[PDB]
């Protein structure tokens, strides 16, 4: 089974700024999607599931 | 070995004491900074209590002498049809313009209140200001 990589270095500092949420990958995606929705406002089926 | 008794003293006092007792082998990274530049109040847990009887908060209402002039102006002339622009830090409303003229005339020696208020309205009308009495 694929193993999650180390989430910090020797100095103990986590690599990702959302580490302490415990869900850095999920909340990083929500942050990226929420950020895209903002830029649009500033600027402004059958075969897929 | 440490202490999670957050209601017993402060993180500084609990840390300082356990360092002396040898329970904590090394000081935490923040300890030396706290010592050199401590907060104004040591962060000690307190339970907020409710006031009873003749105990009242010391906070005082903020009032100014010109507030008396503003209350009368709003009563007599209402709020100006001109809109407040609270974004401009130097905005002056019709009431503020009235208050400044009212203050100028008071410094010229006039002391009556009912007379000092009628002369101010005339001055602004001469300057082109619109003062529609509410009643």
């Amino acid at each position: 089974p694929r193993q999650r990589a180390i989430q910090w270095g020797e100095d103990g500092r986590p690599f990702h700024y959302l580490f302490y949420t415990g869900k850095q990958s999920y909340y990083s995606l929500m942050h990226d999607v929420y950020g895209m929705l903002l830029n649009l406002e500033k600027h402004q089926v059958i075969g897929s599931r | 070995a440490g202490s999670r008794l957050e209601t017993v003293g402060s993180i500084f006092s609990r840390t300082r004491d356990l360092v002396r007792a040898g329970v904590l082998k090394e000081k935490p990274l923040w300890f030396d900074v706290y010592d050199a530049f401590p907060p104004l109040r040591e962060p000690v847990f307190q339970r907020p209590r409710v006031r009873y009887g003749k105990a009242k908060a010391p906070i005082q209402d903020i009032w100014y002498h010109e507030d008396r002039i503003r209350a009368k102006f709003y009563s007599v002339y209402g709020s100006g049809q001109r809109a407040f622009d609270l974004f401009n830090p130097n905005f002056k409303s019709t009431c503020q313009r009235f208050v400044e003229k009212y203050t100028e005339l008071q410094k010229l020696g006039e002391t009556d209140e009912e007379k000092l208020f009628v002369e101010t309205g005339k001055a602004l009308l001469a300057e082109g200001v619109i003062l529609r009495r509410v009643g």
């Binding site: 929500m30 999607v33 929420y34 929705l37 | -």
Partner: protein, 86 residues
């Protein structure tokens, strides 16, 4: 008995609609408290029992009015989520 008749608790019928006239009369007597008064008077309510119910009714009305006020106040924020995704 000594008063004039056909003034008190009297509703006129419109266009032969007796059902709507009866509902209006019943609504009048209900709002004025006569219906509940008639019912409570079929058997004697003892003074200690009347005080208990009157005290219970007055506290329930206050509690319901205070619970309605709270929901009205806290329903202002029932609008759609302004910060969805955060």
């Amino acid at each position: 008995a000594k008063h004039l008749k056909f003034i008190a608790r009297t509703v006129m019928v419109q266009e032969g609609n007796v059902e709507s006239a009866y509902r209006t009369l019943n609504r009048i007597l209900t709002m004025d408290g006569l219906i509940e008064d008639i019912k409570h008077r079929r058997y004697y309510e003892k003074p200690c029992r009347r005080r208990q119910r009157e005290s219970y009714e007055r506290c329930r009305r206050i509690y319901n009015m205070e619970m309605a006020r709270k929901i009205n106040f806290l329903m202002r924020k029932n609008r759609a989520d302004p910060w969805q995704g955060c």
